[PDB]
Amino acid sequence: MLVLGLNGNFSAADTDVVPQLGEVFFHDSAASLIRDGELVAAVEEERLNRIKKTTKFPLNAVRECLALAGARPEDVDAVGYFFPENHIDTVLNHLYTEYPRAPLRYSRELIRQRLKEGLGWDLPDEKLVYVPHHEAHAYSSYLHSGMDSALVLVLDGRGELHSGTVYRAEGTRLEKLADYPVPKSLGGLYLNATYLLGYGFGDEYKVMGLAPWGNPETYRDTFAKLYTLQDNGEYELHGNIMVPNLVSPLFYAEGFRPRRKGEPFTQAHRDFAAALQETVEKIVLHILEYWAKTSGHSRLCFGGGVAHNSSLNGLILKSGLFDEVFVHPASHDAGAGEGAAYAAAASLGTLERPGKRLLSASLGPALGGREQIRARLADWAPLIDVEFPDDAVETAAGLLAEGQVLGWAYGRSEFGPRALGHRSIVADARPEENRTRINAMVKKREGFRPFAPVVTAEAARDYFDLSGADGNHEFMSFVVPVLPERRTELGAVTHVDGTARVQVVSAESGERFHRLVRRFGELTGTPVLLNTSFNNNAEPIVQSLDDVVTSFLTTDLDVLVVEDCLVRGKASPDLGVLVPRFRPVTRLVERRTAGPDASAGAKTHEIHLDYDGGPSAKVSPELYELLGAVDGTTTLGDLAKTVGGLSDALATEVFALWEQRFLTLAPAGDIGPL
C-alpha cells in the first residue's frame, strides 16, 4: 500500500502557468509518501528549487520521495491532492479569465501532465483522488499523535469552504463536530495584521516573535472592535466594505502608520503585535474551552497553519483544558499534502495508520554516502580546508564550549519549518551577546528576533516549565517559560518575556544531536544549545551538500560539521574555480527608461528572480557582460578572461550575488546520485 500526497500549484520550473495566484493555500508545495501506513519520505519543494515557500508543482519532491522509498512511479497505488477538484478548477478558471492567454487546462490534466513529462509516469485517472482540505489536515495531525481518540482542531487561512474545523477522532475515523466560515479566518486575520508591519505571507511567526516586546494594552480596545466572542464557543469577525483587509481601516482611522520595508519597529509596532497575539489567543482558547467540555475529550491534536503559532500552543498547554496536546512538525499546507495521502488510502480500502507517535521529522533526502561526500568536499578544496576527527561530535561540543558558532548538517533533512539537528546552526546558549551577534552577523535579521533552545530530555525540567498538559516538544511546537532561576544562565535563548520555543531532544528523537547536547552539558554544566535553522536570509533551509557548503561560505559561521567532516573557510578562497549557473528563474536585464527632454535614459543593468515577490539587484556593466556569457560549464575565472580577468571588484560583486542566491556557484561536477 504505497500512496503519494501532493499540495501546491501546477507551474513548471521556469514558467508560471499564471503570474499571480491570488490565493494563500498554494504555498509550501511538498510531496509525502506513505507505505503501509507509515510516512517514509517527505520533503518540501522549497528545499529543492530554493524558492522560500514556493507554489511550484512539487516535481523534484516527488522524485526524491520515490528514491528514498526505493519505489518506482508504477509502484504507487494512489495519489491524494490536498483540495477538492471542483474548488481548485473553479479557482483556475477564474485565473484564466484574468489571464486570457493561458490555455484552458484544469488541475487533473495539469497534474498528470507534470507527472508524465517530469517522471515518465502515466497516472490513470482513477488513481488521482481529491480530498477535503481540512480532512487532510486532520488526518496528518491526528494519525501521527500516537493517540487513539482525541479532539482535532484545524485552523488555517482557508480550505474549500471553511477557515476552521473541529473533529472527533477515534481509531481511524474522523467525525466533524463544528466548522467556521471563511470570513471568520484567524489565519486571515493574523495575515491581514502582518501586512501592517511591512511583512507578507510567511512572516506571521516573525510578528509572533515581535509580540513579547509590546504592551498588549495599547491596542486592546481597538482589536476588540474587530471580533466578538459569542455563546457556545462561537465568535464573529467584523468586516468592512472598504478594502480586502479586516484590520487596516480601523487602525488607519486612529493614526497607526504601517511600517515601511527596511525601517525599524517602533514601540507602536510592538504594541500592535502584542495586541494581535493576545486577540488570537483569546479567540482560540474560547473555541477550545467550549469544545473540550462539550466533546468530553482530554486529548487535543491541533493542526492547520495557525498551529505554527508557538506562543498560542504554549497558552493552550498552560490552560489546563487538556491533559495531552500534539502538534505535527509540518502543520501548514505541506502537512495537508501528507494527510491527502491517508485520505486517498482510506477511499481505496481500510486505512493503515502509523504504529507510534512521530518523534523525528528527519524525512527528506540525505546528504550522501561517506565516499561521495568526501570526494565532493575535495572538489571544493580551493575554498575550504577539511579535517576528519576521530569523534566529530566530541570535537563539535568542545568547539561550542570555546564560543564557536557551528553549522551542523547530518542525515535526512527536516520536514516542516523548524531545524531540529539535521540542518541547524548551533552555539552556546548562555551569553546574551550570542543572540545579538547571530541576529546581526550570522542570520542577518532583525534584532528583536528570539532564538530557540534545544535541551536534553534528561535536563529539560531543570531549565523549562513544561507543566500543565503533556505536549510534544520534539519539533519546537510549544513556547514555554524558562524557569526564573535559569533565565540569567540562558541569556541567548530566553525571550524578553522569559519564554523559549523549546526543542527537547532524546536519544529516540535524534540520537546524534542528543549526544552533542549532552556532551556540551558535561563540558560546561549547561546541556542547552541555541538552535537556529541552517540558512541565510535569502534561502530556505539548506538541503544538499553543495547547499550546505555554499551557505557555510556565504554566512559568517566559524566552522561547519557535515557528516563527521570539519570544514573551515580558506584564508583566501579561489572564487575563480566556481562554475556559474542560472537558476531556472534567473533573469538578466539591460534597461532604459525615459530621460530628460524625452530622451532615452542611461543604461542600467539588473539581475532578478522571476517569481511573485522575487528579489532584484543592480549589476555593473562589466558583470552584466560576464554574466551574459554564462554557459553552465566554464568556470568564473575562465569566463572573466573576456572582460579582462577576474578582478577583485568582480569577485566581490559576484560574491554578493551568490550570497543573495541570484545564481548558482559550485565547483565543476556534482556529488552524483545518493
Place this chain on the structure above:
Amino acid sequence: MLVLGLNGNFSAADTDVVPQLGEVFFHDSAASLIRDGELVAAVEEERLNRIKKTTKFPLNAVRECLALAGARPEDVDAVGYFFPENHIDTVLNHLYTEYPRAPLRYSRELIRQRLKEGLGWDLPDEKLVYVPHHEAHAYSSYLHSGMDSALVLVLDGRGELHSGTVYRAEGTRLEKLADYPVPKSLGGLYLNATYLLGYGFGDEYKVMGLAPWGNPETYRDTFAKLYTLQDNGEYELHGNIMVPNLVSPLFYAEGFRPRRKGEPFTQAHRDFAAALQETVEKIVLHILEYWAKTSGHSRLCFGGGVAHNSSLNGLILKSGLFDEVFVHPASHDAGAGEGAAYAAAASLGTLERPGKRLLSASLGPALGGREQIRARLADWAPLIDVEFPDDAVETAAGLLAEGQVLGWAYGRSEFGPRALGHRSIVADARPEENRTRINAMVKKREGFRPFAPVVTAEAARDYFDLSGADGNHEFMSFVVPVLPERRTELGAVTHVDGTARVQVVSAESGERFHRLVRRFGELTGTPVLLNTSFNNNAEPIVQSLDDVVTSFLTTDLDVLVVEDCLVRGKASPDLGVLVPRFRPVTRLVERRTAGPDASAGAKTHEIHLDYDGGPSAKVSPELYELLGAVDGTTTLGDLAKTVGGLSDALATEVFALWEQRFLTLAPAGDIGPLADDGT
C-alpha cells in the same frame, strides 16, 4: 466662483505610486473647471498622456483647463475631489501595506504635492474639499439636464458606500431616496461577465456591441440563478465563496469556455453577451419602474458609468416610464470629477448652476490658431500635402459623396468617450461595406462592432424612431430603432437588430458639423454620415494637431480635414525627418532568460509601456541599438546613420512601433502655446 473638479489617482507622469491599484474607480482621470455655474473647460488626462482611461494624476488636464479659462492657479476658489477623504486614504493605506516600500503619503498631501511641483500652485488646505461620490455623479447629470426637478439614478462600479443611488433633484438640492450596497454592483456584474469573453476593464462597450449578435434564450436560466428581483425595487446578486467574480463559477460548472486571447467569438460567447445585456436591462428597468411609481416623477437623469450602456438607455427611453430622459456625455468617473466641483461650491456657500441644458461636449483644448496650425503643418511637409480650399466644408461634403473616408478635426475636443464632430472619422453611411472597410483598415478592430450615425435635427425623425420619451441625442447616449423602411438605405450604420446609437446634430449643438451633414444630404439625398472616433486601436481620441496628423499618417484614411486645411499623405513619406522621443512610460530592454542547460539564454530585445496592462513588442538588435541613442532632438534619419542608415526594413519596423505608439514621432519643434482665439 472658479472651482476645479478632480478625479483619478495620484501618480506622476513617469512613475506609479504603486504598481496595481486594485480598484475600478481611479480610471478616466480628468480635470473640470466651473465658473459662475457653467462648465467652462473639461478634458480627460488620457487625451494628454495618450494612455487610454489612465489613472494618473490629471496634472496636464488641470493645466489645460486653467489656460482655457484664462486663470492663474491662484484664481481658483475651491478644489473638489470626487470621493470622501477617509475612504480614499483608507484605500491608499491598504495599498501601502501591500507595497511596503511606498512612503506614507495620503491624498491631501499628494494632491498638494502634484499641484505645487506641476504648476507652482500652493493649494491652501481649506480650499480642498472631498465629496460623496454618488452626489458628484448626481450633480453632474442633473445640473446639465436643464430640468428643474427630476428623478436621478446613479449606477456604477462603486462609490465609497454604494453601487447605486436614487435621488430626487429640485433646484440645486439633492435628496437621497434609496441606495444599493457595493456587492450588488451592476457595473461589477457587467465587468465580471466581460472577463469571460477575453476582455477586461474598459471593454464593456465592446461586449454591449456583441450582444445583438447573440440569442438571449441560451443562458437566460443560468443568469437567473445569479440574481433575484424583489419587492420595492430591490434585487439581490447571489455571491460565492470561491473567487472574486460573481459569474465565472456557475458558468464553469455548466461547461462555458472563456474566450482566449486572439480567438474568435464562438456562438456560445455571443449568446452569453446577449443574456448578460438582457439581465442588466431587466434589473435596471425593475429599479426604475419602482422609483418612477413611488416618486411620481416624469423626468429622469441617469448617471454613473453604467449610463454609458446606450442599449440600456434606449430601453429606458422606450419604456414609457418617463416623459424626458437626460444623460451626460461623460457619465463615468470623469463626470463625477466635474460634479465634485459643483459639490465643493455648494459645500462652501450657495450653488450656481448652468442656465441651460448642455448641448455640446466640445470642452477640451483646441488645436491652435490659423497661423500656428499652418506653420506646424509646414513642419510636416516631407510627409503630407496640404491644400487650402475656399469652403473646406463644401469640399469635404463632396469628397464624402464620392466615397472617401475622412478624418475631421476642428476646435475643442469632446469631453467623454464619444466623438461628435471635433475629433471624428466620417464617411458615407449608405454602403454596407463601409463597415468592413473602416473596421478593418482604419480602426483594425472586430467586425461585429457597429458604427454610429450622425443626422441633422431636421432629418432625424425621417430615419430613426425617437419615441417613448424626449431623450437628449446630442451625445449618442441612446440606441434607437432605425425605421424599417430606411434600414437598407443606411447600410453602414444599422446594427443586426436594426438599431443605431444616433447623434442628432443641430445648428446649436455643433454649427460646423451640422452644416457638413446637411450639405452632404443636399448632395446625396441622405443627410446622415457615419461618425466614429478619431483614433486607431492603440490610442485614445486624438487631441493636438500632431496627434491628428500622426493618427492620419498611421491609418488608411483618404483625406484629413483639420481646421479648414485639407491634408493628404505624400507618395513616399520621409520618416527620416521625424524626431523620435520616448514617452514617460516608454521602456527599452534587453533580456536574458535561463537556458535549458542552466546557461544564460540568448538575448532578446523589447520595447514596452510601463503602466498596468501596457503593451510590449519585440524589436530587432539594430533597432534596439538605434532607439538607445534617442536624445529627443536628433532626427530618426540621423540616428539611423550609426547603424548603417535608415533602410526600408528599419523604416518599416519603426513605422509599426509608431502605429502602436511605443514612442513619439513628430517633426522637430512644437506648435507652441495654443493661441488665444478670442473665446
